[model samples]
Target: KVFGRCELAAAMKRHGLDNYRGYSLGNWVCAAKFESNFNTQATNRNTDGSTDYGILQINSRWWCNDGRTPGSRNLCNIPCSALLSSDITASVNCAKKIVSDGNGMNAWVAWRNRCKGTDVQAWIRGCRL
Candidate 1:
């Protein structure tokens, strides 16, 4: 299912992401916008022969395996398909795993390039917090 910015924020907020791994709500909101455009079914092919999965676009190299790739770490111990579902519980849980591993939101290139900065509330401009 597709999600909008407001709903994304609400979900993340309700999921207690405001202080996960020391990341602000803005980081979660902005990164979600760029990584998947709020699309849970989003997947992107990477030049490294890996794929990103779900709203947060967890990477295959370390987070999960789609069964096509061999020798994935499957760090989150979950299937890539699980991250693509309409419900975001698994996605958020796996994301917590990633963050605690020391990556934080930097795991997503979009966050590193865009949301990493100070001003991140733009992703939640019209969202009623």
Candidate 2:
């Protein structure tokens, strides 16, 4: 089935994560829940009302200006909303990068433990990498 925002959100809620194949769904959900309450369209604002952006809560200034790199800016731009609109997989992958150093599941689990008090280490028991 083609996955859209609501579908993805439901999948996340049901499975407790975004990517079911590459990473631990439970760990990713735990991190996203802590980071943005699973609100894929969430954005932050400044006191001056200069900035507002999408899920994963990426700052527009950082992504639109400093991090703009052709396809990257348009494709992976922040503000959760923008990112989600263009590509959810890319957004999730980008979050995985920032949080996991490309380790995806491992990184997600670690971050979840740090911020959400999840016992991911125990969850990893008996799993072969």
Candidate 3:
């Protein structure tokens, strides 16, 4: 599912992404813009031989088990396919686990390079809290 900007914002907020570990709702919304453009089925294969999945781009190497990524920890304890669904519950949950693991939002290099130090409010500008 491809979400509108405000739609994605509302969904994330409902899932408790606001102020999650010091990252604002806009920060996360911005990350999604760069990571997957709000598409729920987005996936990218990393140079490290693992793949990133979903709007948040959770990785197969450390978060989800694709049953193909070598040396996967599957720390999220779910199939990587779980992240591809439009539901986004698993995607949000896994992202929270990554942040809670002390990596902060830096777990996604896209977030670090594109979202950090930027004005993220534009991503959620028209959305109601």
Candidate 4:
């Protein structure tokens, strides 16, 4: 199901981003879609069974010694649940911090450089958040 717009806004705010447009929200939605289909509770394990979790697909074993369990304390000293409360803006911002520590725009730059064909920056600009 598609998320409501306000949900998206909350996600952004939680991440500390300024007011951005819908496209910014869409960029986040797209990222979560591509990464883990926006599953805040998502988890994965390597062939060796090492684990990962959360909306940004954070490697739980890497961030927290608690395995893939949500609400465990990770790098930011916040529980994964605090980061994964279904508030799209919050989730997105939390993901951004994990990915780039408030450098969402620069993170977009690196993402564009590596991905090479995505319009992430355009999406960011369009959203004007």
- Among these predicted structures, which one has the highest TM-score? 3
Q: Which RMSD does model 1 reach against the true structure?
A: 1.5
lDDT of 3 by residue, 13-82 (tens): 9999999999999999989989999999999998778999999988999989988887778999999999
RMSD in Å for model 3? 1.0
In model 3, residue pairs whose N, Cα or C atoms come closer than 3 Å (at least 3 residues apart or on different chains), thus clashing, are none
* Residue-by-residue lDDT tens digits, candidate 1, 1-129: 888778888888888887787888888988888889889999998776778999999988788878776556788888899999988888898898888886667778988987797688666678884
lDDT per residue as tens, model 4, 1-129: 233344443555456553343234445545555555556666565444445445555544334444445444466455444544554444454455555654443343323343335664443343334
TM-score of each: 0.91, 0.43, 0.95, 0.50
lDDT, candidate 2, 46-79, per-residue tens: 4433333434544444343223322334223434
Displacement of the residue 23 alpha carbon in candidate 3, Å: 0.6
Query: Native-vs-model 1 lDDT?
Result: 0.84
Candidates sorted by lDDT, descending order?
A: 3, 1, 4, 2
Error of 2 at 67 (Å): 10
Error of 1 at 80 (Å): 0.4
